[PDB]
């Protein structure tokens, strides 16, 4: 992101990290 | 001792003789030395030269080789031998086959090598070292093609005895259709002890040296020198540029002391027109001297025409691995360097060499092929000179590791410097190359980006920028009573000039002289800009809201200087080609002509562009406050409809004008079917953004429903679309806020229709101001012709009838039309 935000296939890098935060929210909801 | 690898197969025999004396029995064998050097020569003559053998010809005389027709056959073979893959040498269709510059030695050799054969330059050819070879293209000359017939002529430059041996320096000159193409320079070394000072000399052509005579204790020095003969003794040298085209014959009596020194050549002066004229001769003669004083003088007190300037840091280009071939037979076949020490194990062994050594010229060509690939982006023509030192000898099947560095610049040519090492890490080759930059155009931006501190980073560092700003700032301070640097650095909101004191009354006369012409109902109307300013005035204040740096008259010269200073920095670092084409966009054109054609002084450039900014402030009536009824919008004709072209806009806009009787025009043709700029009456710009807002939504395709469907009903269709937007845009508040519509964006800040016919009226005063500030003497035609692309006519500048004619058709100028009428000033 930081490399490419230096300047398509950026909206894809963005919803790959949006998606990991959905899963990550479930894991720390599970640790709670 | 036999060579089998000869010109015509018939093997060649070197008879080496030896006295066998049995009376002296410790050392019974002794070499016969009487005519030993003239057996060794006879042999090499059979192998190299194609003439009747004769070593009685003067070294000082010129040597001329056979005319050599280049053929695709020869060039094809040569490139495979050396390993030069470059596309320029392959036979493709259309474009003609080029020869590499290396190929010069194949043309030159029979002439060049003949220079070391004479009786008077006596040496053991078996102990001959090629020290250094060089090529130098004569400026302008295109490289060798494949149909060309190429005359050669070689001249011995130096023969000089050194302790360790005799160094012969030869200068071959290739010619095509009567003109020089390039100079080949070879230095040969005969190892030995020579005391042959009778037959030793130096006959160089020195580099052209120029002196700018500025002072009177420069002219008084030149008049002291016996050797500075003038034709007209009274001739005025002050503020003249003298060039000394000098050559120096030198004979020797000893290793260090010269028997006779001789310097001579024309002294030329650059005229107002930049043609040169002979006005003098150098005529220095001496007996037993230790020096040439003439050249020692010109080195210190003058300069050369070109100056190399080193980059801060050398840039590594590459580190490449060439390989010497297993045998030196194929290089020898194409070159005609049949030297037996390269092919025959026995001759190599008789010369105490470590093996049948690779030809130096093979190593030279090989490496020059890598320089041409990594520094000339594989374009033959760019590599412009090349000079090789042969340091150590190279054996077949070696792995050479050459390191190439961009090291400096000289007048737009890159200054490449390489060294080549073998596996043992020993330097074998070293050398330099001059390489043209790619064919270059400079384009100077116009108004838009004008930020506080613009160009001030480059003013801290650069000596060349500092000259430009400090010169301009001092001119503005003494003429208009403000610093442009203060304006650019601080961007004040207000700026009062004061007209106090001797220097203030002078500054006030400069503001009172500035006039414009507008159409005021009836006629043309001459006026002073700055009407407030009269002889009883003691101050004048310039106001803005945001800052004075966004007020056109300060922006115009700031922007122009920024550019002139950027460019003068480049030129000082050697980065500007001699042949560059240039253009500016609008105001850009002034920066560009000051920079690449020195048409104006810095002081004159910033005057003109200040007056320009001033004339483009006052041409529109703006009664209210800083608000007019004119503006300009940027159109993207691609966005309104995919079929809407530069024929669609040129109609719509021409009709909206002819219909509503309100001035609107296309002023900038920027990017085709993508960026135009329309300027005129803010109302007529509000119709055009609505007519184009219409055709977007309505999807009515002008060209489809144009000449195809309805003939001269297009005007019927369109006038209908105009009149429902036109008479809707006549009812706005007097100074109408202009808004944006799908295709058309309004350019914020621009309050005047510059580049329209609206200010064809305000031209006579601006013309008369350019004629004061652009002098005839400062226009070098050579520097504009085919390089400067004006905005008026997008046609490379030329001083021919068809160009003048073409200008008249766009302008309607009487000083132009009166030239076309009597274009017979070919009779002076």
């Amino acid at each position: 992101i930081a490399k490419l935000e230096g300047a398509g296939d950026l909206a894809l890098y963005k919803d790959s990290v949006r998606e990991n935060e959905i899963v990550l929210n479930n894991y720390n909801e599970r640790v709670d | 001792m036999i060579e089998n690898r000869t010109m015509d197969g018939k093997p060649v025999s070197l008879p080496l003789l030896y006295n066998f004396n049995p009376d002296n029995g410790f050392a019974p064998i002794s070499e016969v030395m009487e005519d030993r050097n003239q057996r060794i020569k006879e042999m090499y003559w059979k192998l190299w030269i194609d003439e009747p053998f004769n070593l009685d010809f003067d070294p000082r005389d010129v040597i001329k080789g056979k005319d050599f027709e280049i053929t695709a056959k020869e060039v094809y073979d040569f490139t495979h031998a050396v390993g030069n893959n470059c596309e320029d040498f392959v036979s493709r269709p259309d474009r003609t086959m080029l020869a590499p510059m290396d190929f010069a030695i194949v043309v030159g050799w029979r002439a060049i090598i003949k220079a070391i054969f004479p009786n008077t330059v006596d040496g053991d050819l078996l102990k001959l070292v090629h020290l250094s070879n060089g090529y130098k293209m004569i400026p302008g000359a295109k490289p060798l093609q494949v149909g060309d017939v190429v005359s050669t002529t070689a001249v011995i430059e130096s023969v000089v005895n050194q302790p360790t041996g005799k160094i012969v320096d030869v200068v071959g000159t290739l010619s095509r259709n009567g003109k020089p193409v390039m100079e080949v320079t070879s230095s040969f070394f005969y190892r030995g002890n020579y005391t042959d000072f009778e037959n030793t000399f130096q006959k160089t052509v020195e580099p052209v040296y120029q002196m700018h005579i500025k002072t009177s204790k420069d002219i008084a020095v030149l008049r002291s020198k016996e050797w500075f003969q003038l034709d007209d003794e009274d001739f005025d040298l002050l503020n003249k540029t003298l060039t000394f085209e000098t050559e120096t014959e030198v004979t020797f009596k000893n290793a260090n002391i010269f028997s006779s020194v001789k310097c001579f050549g024309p002294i030329k002066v650059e005229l107002p027109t930049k043609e040169t004229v002979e006005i003098g001769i150098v005529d220095y003669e001496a007996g037993a001297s230790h020096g040439n004083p003439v050249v020692d003088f010109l080195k210190r007190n003058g300069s050369t025409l070109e100056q190399k300037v080193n980059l801060e840091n050398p840039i590594p280009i590459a580190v490449l691995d060439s390989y010497t071939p297993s045998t030196n037979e194929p290089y020898a076949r194409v070159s005609g360097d049949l030297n037996p020490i390269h092919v025959s194990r026995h001759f190599a062994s008789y010369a105490n060499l470590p093996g049948t050594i690779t030809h130096g010229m093979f190593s030279s060509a090989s490496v020059r092929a890598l320089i041409e690939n990594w520094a000339a982006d594989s374009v033959s023509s760019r590599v412009r000179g090349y000079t090789c030192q042969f340091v150590d000898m190279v054996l077949p099947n070696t792995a050479l590791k050459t390191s190439i560095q961009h090291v400096g610049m000289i007048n737009g040519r890159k200054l490449i410097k390489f060294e080549t090492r073998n596996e043992d890490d020993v330097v074998v080759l070293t050398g330099e190359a001059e390489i043209e930059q790619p064919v270059t155009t400079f384009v100077f931006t116009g108004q838009g980006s004008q930020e506080q501190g613009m160009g001030m980073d480059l003013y801290k560092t650069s000596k060349a920028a500092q000259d430009v700003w400090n010169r301009a700032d001092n001119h503005f301070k003494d003429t208009y009573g403000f610093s442009i640097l203060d304006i650019v650095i601080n961007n004040p909101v207000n700026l009062t000039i004061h007209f106090g004191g001797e220097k203030g009354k002078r500054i006030r006369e400069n503001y009172s002289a500035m006039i414009f012409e507008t159409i005021v109902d009836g006629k043309l109307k001459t006026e002073k800009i700055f009407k407030e300013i009269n002889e009883h005035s003691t101050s004048y204040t310039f106001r803005s809201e945001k800052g004075l740096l966004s007020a056109t008259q300060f922006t115009q010269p700031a922007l122009t200087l920024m550019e002139k200073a950027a460019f003068e920095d480049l030129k000082s670092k050697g980065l500007i080609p001699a042949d560059a084409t240039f253009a500016g966009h609008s105001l850009g054109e002034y920066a560009a002509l000051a920079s690449l054609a020195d048409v104006m002084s810095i002081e004159s450039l910033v005057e003109v562009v200040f007056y320009r900014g001033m004339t483009m402030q006052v041409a529109v009536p703006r009664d209210e406050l800083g608000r007019s009824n004119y503006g300009m919008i940027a159109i993207n004709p691609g966005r309104v409809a995919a079929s809407f072209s530069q024929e669609a806009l040129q109609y719509v806009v021409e009709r909206v004008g002819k219909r509503t009787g309100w001035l609107v025009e296309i002023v900038n043709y920027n990017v085709e079917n993508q960026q135009y700029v329309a300027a005129g009456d803010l109302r007529a710009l509000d119709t055009v953004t609505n007519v184009l807002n219409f055709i977007k939504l309505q999807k009515i395709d002008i060209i489809e429903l144009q000449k195809s469907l309805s003939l001269e009903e297009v005007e019927g269709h369109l006038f209908e679309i105009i009149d429902e937007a036109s008479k809707k845009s006549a009812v706005k508040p007097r100074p109408l806020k202009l808004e944006r519509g799908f295709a058309c964006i309004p350019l914020v800040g621009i309050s005047v229709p510059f580049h329209s016919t609206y200010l064809m009226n305000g031209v006579k005063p601006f013309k008369s101001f350019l004629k004061k500030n652009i002098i005839k003497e400062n226009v070098k035609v050579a520097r504009l012709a085919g390089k400067y692309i004006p905005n008026l006519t997008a046609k490379p500048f030329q001083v021919t009838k068809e160009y003048f004619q073409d200008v008249y058709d766009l302008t309607g100028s009487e000083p132009i039309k009166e030239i076309i009428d009597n274009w017979e000033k070919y009779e002076q």
Binding site: - | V443, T445, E665, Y669, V671, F754, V763, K767, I774, L792
Partner: protein, 246 residues
Amino acid sequence: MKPEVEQELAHILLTELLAYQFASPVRWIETQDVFLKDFNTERVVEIGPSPTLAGMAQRTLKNKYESYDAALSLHREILCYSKDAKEIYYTPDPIADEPVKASLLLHVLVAHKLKKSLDSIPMSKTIKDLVGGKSTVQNEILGDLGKEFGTTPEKPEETPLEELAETFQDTFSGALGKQSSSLLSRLISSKMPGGFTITVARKYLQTRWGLPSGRQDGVLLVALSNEPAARLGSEADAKAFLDSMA
């Protein structure tokens, strides 16, 4: 035409070109098409504070010079003074025991097969990227990871080493296994720890530096990636080797 005259006329024309310039439209379409086509300019330098005309040349070249450029094999450079100074000026810029990670072991196994240094391989890069050319070495790496870690993903030469190291880290437990053990057995015997074998080399670490089994393996693996190659005299030197590796 005499130069004195040619100069007189150039002066007239140049004065009139400039005079009228602001009272006629700026023909920058035709201008571009003079210096891009009729001079085949290989390099446009925009002198100016922002890159306006460099934007315009980029767009003009793409719109109607794609087919013209390709047919001359004419590579073209568009440089702003403000943005691309470095191109124009030619001035570029230059102790507790732990079982070995998969992320180290994988790096070393790859590094060793490419005859390359443990930092010249970046971990954020696919195996088919590092050996793109020779396909033999690629499969030969995959054969080595097969022996070493057992079960692989599907198309392991399409996932970066960084990413692939994790997939192994799970089902592997600081085990040197078949391939790595056999590479160290060669490293020691084939190099000139002249008399001192593995057990004698291990004990030196464990005694001098204080590194048990897990950490011990970790140092040997870095030694494999920094192979001395050259003959080395004695233990005195082969001790100075193991010191730099640890």
